[PDB]
Design a protein around this ligand. Structure first.
Ligand SMILES: Cc1cccc([C@H]2C=C[C@@H](N3CCN(Cc4ccc(=O)[nH]c4)CC3)CC2)c1
Ligand SMILES: Cc1cccc([C@H]2C=C[C@@H](N3CCN(Cc4ccc(=O)[nH]c4)CC3)CC2)c1
Ligand SMILES: Cc1cccc([C@H]2C=C[C@@H](N3CCN(Cc4ccc(=O)[nH]c4)CC3)CC2)c1
Lengths: 620, 620
């Protein structure tokens, strides 16, 4: 141990030391045991002392009022405020617990009548309990904000909440995150009780401050509560929050006619829309928000009327881009050999050694125009996604990768080799086959990026990705463990052996190439049938055949059959997740002369400047 | 039949003969029928006789009191104790039933009032009914110990249990196994009723004997009851037994703060810990104990902070050990042939016949140091596990094998060949390829022993083991049945045939090697296309192809697909069973300068010398 860095996490161990030492500070001091209990008979003596430390601190800086607030002794705490009036005017002062007063803690007890007596002792509710135990993180179980009625918001006690409001509680105060009361209601674990908490707290603003008047306010990172429920995936309240958002028109027996506001769902301007905030997460449960009556009908209108024409024609032109690129790359200039087959005895079989800048003929001019287009088209790829990563971060760019498929890397990786294949053409380098070789195969792989606009072959592409980054990768870290052994084991066998017959391997690098082919059974297999092989070979070849082909190959095809039925229900909305992610990027990049806006605008219908959308259906 | 040994088990047949003969002893003697029933009117005559044998024995040695204790005739048994006061002072005296008094048997009747009248007749409870029908084994349905209130413990009758205690019942008496009352409560089949039996029996000790005062006592093999529930897998009571073990600190609304004792869970010293006793069994249900709130959080702390660094670096060095071993074994010294290709006409193709102790050159010195390391490192393997089997038994060593994987054998089997490859190098033997051949391949197989510290490829290794010892082994005992037939059947066909064409087999041993390759379809297949083959061959080759490749191969890949979904839920805790078994051995072998101890020690916190651990969570 000499170079440990960022691999301790001893702060969680440190607060545990803060836990037990604080209990020792309880145990040594006598009056804190009387603060741990009622102990009212001895407590009458404790305040009738000379030097009873009424303002002393714990290990994290409590008082007896703080401990009585913990162990909810309402009778004993009545004695505390008698000779110590200043005692209510002190919060917690530790790094872990900063700003927490006893008025906060009785709210955490969530069934108290001391809170009346505490506010009878002029207790301010203007505290900000912003200790490090109160920040949202995967190391605390709660996240309650900074404020007393905000703390009361998370515990569902209408008797206390209304009693907080009637003593001057500013409801529209915010936290260090910029989040107010209403933001914290969304992130609660119990989705049930917050709806009554939301509906009751609506009734107390009624205020002339028309500036974002009670809930239209974002945080420092610009997140509004109606949009926040889509972020954290509130299935329950988003239906409930849509009620004042939805406006109805008329009904017809079992039929109705409604209208949607839509004004903070579609991308109006350059602002972060709701739809953009859907796919920009790793949270799983927020993706099934797309099965709601305002949501998918916007999606299943504009892709039906605009996307499928725009996707296929964009799909069509990319198909044209590669075939002419295939046309030129199969027609490369070529001469025969010049250097007379000099050095290797029967170990060369190439005879061409390709041409140079001597190029001018009335046939290459077709190829000259042909390879001219694919260079300039490759620049176009480097003018639409290269400007993205100047502002879409690095990890923020890779955040899109796993959700929507890793195609955005490979399309630049296509054009990256296209830069090479004209430079080395220009300077007349030796290796032209190798940079074209990736360049030919990486283009046709990007055709499956357009295998998304059809239901019949769309979702099949997804579980390919779920096995390349999934079960094939875990298979590779055992397959290589098998083949690195047997190949070296095979190599010593025919080491003492002439390679003119059974030249399946004669040297160690080709041996690994051979034994890998023995693993996948894509080759023939060694047999000479004229000379008996060495005595070890017949043992080791068959044993390799059993545990790899009969066992390990057929095991690998079995484990993927386990995958499909337990990913079958989820892949349908993944296919829906393809469309919307395709929709927003296609909508945002393409200009205003194209793409008429969704919905129906106002400005002629007496309904504002906004944009409405309807639906009608049988209620049955 | 002349040499039968240990293949009878006629003792179970023998006790059945003891059953029916005892019923005949009932049937012949007249008063035992009156002991089989009430028969009180004739029973008034039976004791008013001259030579009524009041102390006689059955076939296994009953009395009429014993039979009345069986057929629970409380009215008739009142007559028995009148003229026979000594009759209560006799237990059963057979080999099968030894030490069983009638006071025991009325407790087995579990709803009696004769037990008051029996103890009114000064019946001792100091009996030890240790007959061979009372030993724990897979040949009796119960195991109740030796004592009356111990017998009453298994029947849940608080009216009788308290009546046993108030007549001088030593609760802390033990059996021949060293097990007391409380041990027998754990091994009961009904997990429900014992909790009330445990909680009630706690209240009667209260005694000044601080020596293991009521339940801290082990048996002769050193097993304490709190540890015994982990041994026999009591899911129910281990949560219940943790209540006085767990100590709480404080709560916070829906949040709490507790603390665990832990003092008989982690390996404190050289004693048999709880965690050691988990994996040292074949019992299945005891392995799901690891899903409890004191248990896995110890596991999911110290492997997260210490194991994964220690496992990977141990995983790293073994990867270095084999590549230099690969480096030397591919660079063996070699000369060309000397003996002029003398004996076989075109049946040798080797031309090297490797070198001897003529070795000194400034290139082999690198290999000399290279093979020096792998010899000494092989000794290190034989210094850590060779000392284990001096005290970890033979079958006790193989008891670890099936649970954690059969890698402990193969790692010595690795170094076993490493001893050979330097001796035969020293004495210049002929065969160097063959002992290296196992030695190269057996090392790389042990790399998958380090394919356990990752979730992505860890559990995939387990069902490999569940098919090598599982479905491939049952496939081998039919595959060999197929291929031993057809190969001999094939051999006579091309027996009357020249081997210069279609030399797939020309002799019987190579034929089995060929037909095995025909089974797995890893070779090409016989075709000459110039001479018609014999008339039998076209029939027998295709029929072999159907029932093996089309039928038997594809059947074998189908039956393993049946396995995965019905082993899918269980393999997750098997992967957890990997970690803890890795944890204890890594912890015990590595010394005190490494591995800071788990939990938080006392000695400064007013809580003893012990070691505490906490958790905090939402109760919700
Ligand atoms: C993942 C995993 C976990 C545990 C074990 C294994 C397997 C690893 C190597 C296997 N052996 C089998 C074949 N053997 C050659 C042989 C030896 C004698 C013979 O008569 N025929 C063939 C060489 C290596 C054993 C088991 C894999
Ligand atoms: C496990 C098990 C249980 C019960 C039965 C079997 C099979 C065993 C041998 C099988 N036969 C089928 C093929 N037959 C050659 C043939 C004969 C006539 C023909 O027209 N074509 C091909 C040779 C042996 C029959 C069934 C296996
Ligand atoms: C190519 C291939 C190789 C191996 C296996 C398979 C298929 C055969 C078993 C199937 N599994 C999953 C479905 N399951 C049905 C079921 C039964 C009860 C229930 O409550 N729900 C669902 C039955 C077992 C799926 C996979 C295919």
């Amino acid at each position: 141990f000499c170079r440990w860095f960022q691999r301790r996490e001893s702060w969680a161990q440190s607060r545990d030391e803060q836990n037990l030492l604080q209990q020792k500070r309880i145990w040594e001091s006598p009056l804190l045991l009387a603060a741990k209990d009622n102990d009212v008979q001895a407590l009458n003596k404790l305040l009738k002392y000379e030097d009873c430390k009424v303002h002393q601190r714990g290990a994290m800086g409590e008082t007896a009022l703080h401990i009585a607030a913990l162990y909810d002794n309402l009778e004993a705490a009545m004695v505390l405020m008698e000779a110590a009036p200043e005692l209510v005017f002190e919060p917690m002062t530790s790094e872990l617990y900063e700003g927490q007063t006893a008025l906060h803690i009785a709210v955490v007890n969530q069934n108290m009548n001391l809170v009346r007596a505490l506010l009878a002792r002029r207790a301010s509710v203007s505290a900000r309990a912003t200790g490090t135990a109160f920040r949202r993180s995967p190391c605390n179980l709660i996240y309650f904000g900074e404020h007393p009625l905000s703390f009361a918001a998370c515990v569902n006690s209408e008797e206390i909440v209304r009693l907080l409001i009637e003593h001057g509680a500013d409801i529209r105060a915010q936290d260090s995150l910029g989040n107010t009361v209403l933001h914290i209601l969304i992130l609660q674990p119990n989705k049930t009780f917050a709806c009554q908490m939301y509906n009751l707290l609506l009734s107390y603003d009624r205020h002339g401050d028309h500036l974002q008047p009670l809930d239209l306010v974002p945080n420092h990172q610009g997140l509004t509560p109606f949009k926040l429920a889509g972020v954290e995936g509130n299935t329950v309240m988003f239906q409930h929050l849509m009620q004042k958002r939805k406006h109805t028109q008329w009904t017809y027996g079992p039929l109705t006619s409604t209208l949607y506001d839509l004004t903070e769902i579609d991308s109006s301007g350059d602002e972060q829309s709701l739809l953009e905030l859907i796919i920009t997460t790793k949270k799983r449960e927020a993706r099934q928000i797309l099965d709601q009556t305002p949501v998918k009908e916007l999606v299943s209108l504009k892709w039906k009327r605009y996307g499928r024409p725009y996707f296929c024609m964009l799909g069509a032109i990319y198909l044209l881009y590669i075939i002419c690129f295939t046309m030129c790359c199969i027609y490369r200039p070529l001469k025969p050999r010049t250097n007379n087959r000099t050095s290797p005895r029967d170990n060369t079989l190439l005879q061409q050694k390709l041409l140079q800048e001597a190029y001018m003929t009335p046939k290459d001019d077709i190829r000259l125009v042909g390879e001219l287009v694919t260079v300039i088209g490759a620049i176009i790829i480097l003018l639409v996604e290269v400007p993205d990563i100047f502002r879409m971060g690095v990890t923020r760019f890779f955040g899109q990768t796993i959700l929507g498929g890793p195609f955005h890397v490979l399309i630049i990786t296509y054009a990256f080799m296209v830069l090479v294949t004209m430079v080395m053409r220009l300077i007349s380098a030796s290796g032209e086959v190798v940079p074209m070789s990736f360049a030919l195969v990486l283009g046709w792989c990007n055709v499956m990026y357009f295998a998304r606009g059809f239901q019949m072959l769309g979702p099949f592409t997804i579980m390919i990705q779920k096995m390349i980054f999934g079960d094939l990768m875990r298979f590779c870290w055992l397959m290589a463990v098998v083949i690195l052994g047997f190949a070296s084991a095979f190599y010593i066998i025919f080491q003492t052996e002439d390679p003119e017959e059974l030249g399946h391997f004669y040297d160690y690098p080709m041996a690994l190439f051979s034994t890998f082919e023995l693993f996948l059974t894509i080759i023939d297999g060694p047999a000479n049938y004229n000379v008996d092989l060495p005595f070890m070979y017949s043992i080791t070849y068959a044993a390799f055949a059993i545990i790899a082909t009969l066992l390990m190959l057929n095991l690998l095809i079995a484990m993927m059959g386990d995958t499909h039925w337990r990913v079958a229900h989820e892949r349908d909305e993944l296919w829906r997740a393809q469309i919307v992610a395709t929709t927003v990027m296609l909508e945002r990049k393409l200009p205003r002369c194209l793409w008429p806006r969704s919905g129906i605008c106002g400005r002629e219908y007496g309904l504002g400047d906004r944009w409405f959308l309807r639906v009608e259906d049988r209620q049955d």
